[PDB]
Enzyme design. Structure first.
Site, short mmCIF file in Angstrom:
data_model
loop_
_atom_site.label_atom_id
_atom_site.label_comp_id
_atom_site.label_asym_id
_atom_site.label_seq_id
_atom_site.Cartn_x
_atom_site.Cartn_y
_atom_site.Cartn_z
CD1 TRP A 134 -2.70 6.24 -3.13
CD2 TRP A 134 -4.00 6.74 -4.91
NE1 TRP A 134 -2.96 7.58 -3.10
CE2 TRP A 134 -3.75 7.95 -4.13
CE3 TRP A 134 -4.79 6.82 -6.05
CZ2 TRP A 134 -4.27 9.18 -4.49
CZ3 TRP A 134 -5.30 8.08 -6.42
CH2 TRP A 134 -5.04 9.23 -5.66
NE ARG A 170 -9.90 -1.08 3.54
CZ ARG A 170 -10.42 -1.51 2.39
NH1 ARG A 170 -11.64 -1.15 2.00
NH2 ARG A 170 -9.71 -2.34 1.65
CB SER A 200 -1.18 -0.27 4.69
OG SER A 200 -1.14 -1.56 4.03
CD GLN A 235 0.28 -4.46 5.60
OE1 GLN A 235 1.18 -3.61 5.51
NE2 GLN A 235 -0.92 -4.29 5.04
CE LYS A 242 -8.47 -6.78 -0.05
NZ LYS A 242 -9.07 -5.87 0.93
CD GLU A 254 -15.80 -2.28 6.05
OE1 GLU A 254 -14.94 -3.15 5.76
OE2 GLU A 254 -17.02 -2.39 5.77
CB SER A 281 -0.86 0.04 1.26
OG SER A 281 -1.64 -1.15 1.42
CG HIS A 289 -11.61 -4.41 6.70
ND1 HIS A 289 -12.25 -3.87 5.64
CD2 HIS A 289 -10.31 -4.64 6.30
CE1 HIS A 289 -11.40 -3.79 4.60
NE2 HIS A 289 -10.21 -4.27 5.01
O1 LIG Z 1 -4.93 -6.43 6.35
C1 LIG Z 1 -4.33 -5.82 5.43
O2 LIG Z 1 -3.13 -6.06 5.17
C2 LIG Z 1 -5.01 -4.80 4.64
C3 LIG Z 1 -6.30 -4.90 4.31
C4 LIG Z 1 -7.03 -3.89 3.45
O3 LIG Z 1 -7.88 -3.09 4.27
C5 LIG Z 1 -6.08 -2.98 2.70
O4 LIG Z 1 -6.81 -1.93 2.07
C6 LIG Z 1 -5.06 -2.45 3.68
O5 LIG Z 1 -4.27 -1.43 3.05
C7 LIG Z 1 -4.19 -3.60 4.16
#
Ligand SMILES: O=C(O)C1=C[C@@H](O)[C@@H](O)[C@H](O)C1
Ligand SMILES: O=C(O)C1=C[C@@H](O)[C@@H](O)[C@H](O)C1
Ligand SMILES: [Zn+2]
Ligand SMILES: [Zn+2]
Ligand SMILES: [Zn+2]
Lengths: 251, 251
Positions: free
Chosen positions: A46, A81, A231, A235, A169, A85, A20, A142
Site C-alpha cells: 500500500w 515513500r 508504481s 515495472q 532493498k 526518495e 502497489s 533509492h
Molecule cells: O522500483 C520499484 O518497483 C519500487 C520501489 C519501491 O520504492 C516501492 O515502494 C515502489 O512502489 C516500487
C-alpha cells in the site's frame, strides 16, 4: 535466511511478486483493492504516500482495515515513500516515524517499509517497535539519478542488515547498460559476502527491466509488477512478470 | 549494420531464435525436420558433425536437400562443430574447408558456421568464397568449461569482425554468477564500442540463462532454444523463448 510473512516464504524458490496499491481516498483504496483481487501477486504494497489523509491517523487506519477486508490472503506491506526518495509527498521525520508506528499498532499490516536514510536512531527504534509487534521491516534506499558504484550499493545493503532490516532493498537508476550490470554485480557480491537474509534489488526504467526479471540467479528475492499503472519506472504487467519468473525458474 | 537472410533481418528488433537439428542418418534428419517444421523459430541450424561419414560429400548434400524439402521457409545454417570445440568429430583443416565450400556450392544453405580458431588464412578465404555465392557466415568460438576474461571475449569478437564474419558468435561456460556478468559485460562493450554488425553471445548452463533472454538490451542478436520436449539446463523451449523475448521487446 528466509522471511515468512503469513505462509509466504520470501528468499526461497522463484522471486516473489509485489504490487502497489495507490489510492487518494478511502473510496479509491477500496476500488483499487477490489480490482487487485483479479491479479496474481504475492505481497500487496500500500503506497500510503498517495493517500491524501495521511496526517489523520483514523483515516489511515480505516483505509488499512478496508484493504484487509477486501484482500484477505496476501501479506500487506505499508509503505510511505517519501518525496525525497521519489514518492508523492513529504513529511517531517517525526510524522513519518509516527505514521509507521501507528501502522505497526493497528495489527492490520504484516510489514512496514523504512527508508535507510531517515536517521539511524529513528530507524533502529522503529525496527524494534515493529519487531515487538511481529511486524517485519523492508528497509529501502533509492537513487533516481544514477547508479552508485557496486561497493557503495553493497555497503548500503549491509548497513540495512546492521540496522535490523528483515529484507534490505535498493533501487537505482541506470544511465548506461553497464550500470544495469553494476546493479546485478552488487546483488551477487552482497549475496556472497554479507547477506544472511533475503535482499531485493532493482535497476529502474526500461533500460533496467532485465533486473526485475532475473533476480533468481543473481540473488534478488522479490520484484515489483504493475497491475494497471507502474508504481516505479520499469515495472511490467504482473501476469507477464509471473510468466517470465516461472520460465526462468524452470530453465 | 544488419544481416538479411531470406526476409529475416538479424540485428533488428527482438533477438532471433535458432534451433539445432542433429541426426546421424538421412532418416534421422528427415524425422527431426518433420518434428521441427511447425515450431516457432527463425533459423534452422543443422549440426553436421552429428552426421555420419561427412567426408562423403554426396551423402551430406542429400541430407541438406532433404532438410530443405521439409523446412522450406526458414534460413538454413550449416554447422560442422569440430570436436576441439565441443563437437562430435574432427576433420583435417582441408576436409573442413572442403565440406563448407561444398555446402556453399549446393545452393541449399543460407549460412555457414566457421570456427575462429580454424586458422586465419583458411577462414578468410572461405568467408570470401561464401560471400561470392551469397552465403552468410557466422564465425564462432566456444569454451565449454570456463569463461575467459571480458577483455579476451571482446578480442575474439573483434577478430571475427576483422576476418569478415557477418555475425560473430561466442558461447562460454560460467563457473560462477560473476562469470555470467563477465559475458554480458563483454557483449555490452563490444556492441557499443566495436561492433559494426550483429553479434551473438551466450553464457551456458542454467546460471547463464539471462544471456539467452537479454539480447535486445545488452546486444546479442540471436539465441538458441529447443523444439524437443526434453532439453538441457539453461535451454528454453522455443515457445517460451518467444514469449519472454516478446515481453522484453514490448516492455
Ligand atoms: O522500483 C520499484 O518497483 C519500487 C520501489 C519501491 O520504492 C516501492 O515502494 C515502489 O512502489 C516500487
Ligand atoms: O546451448 C545451446 O542450446 C546451443 C548453442 C549453440 O552453440 C548451438 O550451435 C548448439 O547446437 C546448441
Ligand atoms: Zn502494542
Ligand atoms: Zn561457384
Ligand atoms: Zn577446458
Amino acid at each position: 535466511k528466509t522471511v515468512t510473512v503469513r505462509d509466504l516464504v520470501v528468499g526461497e524458490g522463484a522471486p516473489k511478486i509485489i504490487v502497489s496499491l495507490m489510492g487518494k481516498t478511502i473510496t479509491d483504496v477500496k476500488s483499487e483493492a477490489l480490482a487487485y483481487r483479479e491479479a496474481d501477486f504475492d505481497i500487496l504494497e500500500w503506497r500510503v504516500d498517495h493517500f491524501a489523509n495521511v496526517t489523520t491517523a483514523e483515516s489511515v487506519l480505516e483505509a488499512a482495515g478496508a484493504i484487509r477486508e477486501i484482500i484477505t490472503d496476501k501479506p500487506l506491506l505499508f509503505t510511505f515513500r517519501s518525496a525525497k526518495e521519489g514518492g508523492e509527498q513529504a513529511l517531517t521525520t517525526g510524522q513519518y516515524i509516527d505514521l509507521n508506528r501507528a501502522a505497526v499498532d493497528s495489527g492490520l499490516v504484516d510489514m512496514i517499509d523504512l527508508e535507510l536514510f531517515t536517521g539511524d536512531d529513528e530507524v533502529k527504534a522503529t525496527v524494534g517497535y515493529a519487531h515487538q509487534h511481529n511486524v517485519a521491516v523492508i528497509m529501502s534506499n533509492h537513487d533516481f539519478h544514477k547508479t552508485p558504484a557496486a561497493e557503495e550499493i553493497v555497503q548500503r545493503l549491509r548497513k540495512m542488515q546492521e540496522l535490523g532490516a528483515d529484507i534490505p532493498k535498493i533501487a537505482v537508476m541506470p544511465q548506461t547498460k553497464a550500470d544495469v550490470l553494476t546493479l546485478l554485480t552488487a546483488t551477487v557480491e552482497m549475496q556472497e559476502r554479507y547477506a544472511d537474509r533475503p535482499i531485493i534489488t532493482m535497476s529502474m526504467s526500461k533500460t533496467g527491466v532485465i533486473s526485475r526479471l532475473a533476480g533468481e540467479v543473481f540473488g534478488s528475492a522479490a520484484t515489483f509488477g504493475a497491475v494497471k499503472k507502474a508504481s516505479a519506472p520499469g515495472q511490467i504487467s504482473v501476469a507477464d512478470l509471473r510468466t517470465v519468473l516461472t520460465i526462468l525458474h524452470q530453465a
